[PDB]
């Protein structure tokens, strides 16, 4: 579909994605576009952090649905 991911600057971007396709490779498509390593990404929809254990069908993502990216801090 067409989905939106908003970063915390306010910079919405736009992906081409398949409902079959998992969050992991959605991160990979973001990885492809803004060059952010997938492992460092927190994605959030309807106020919940998306578990790569599951699928965007399972999260009931819909065309023109809006996702939230925040980056992950590594720690000591």
């Amino acid at each position: 579909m067409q989905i939106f991911v908003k970063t915390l600057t306010g910079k919405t971007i736009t992906l081409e994605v398949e409902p079959s396709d998992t969050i992991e490779n959605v991160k990979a498509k973001i990885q492809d576009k803004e060059g952010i390593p997938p492992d460092q990404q927190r994605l959030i929809f309807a106020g919940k952090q998306l578990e790569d254990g599951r699928t965007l069908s399972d999260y009931n993502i819909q065309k023109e649905s809006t996702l939230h990216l925040v980056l992950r801090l590594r720690g000591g």
């Binding site: 970063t7 915390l8 600057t9 990216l69 925040v70 980056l71 801090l73």
Partner: peptide, 13 residues
């Protein structure tokens, strides 16, 4: 201070 990391953010859009 990069808002992407979630620590700080801009005070308005």
């Amino acid at each position: 201070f990069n808002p992407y990391y979630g620590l700080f953010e801009y005070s308005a859009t």
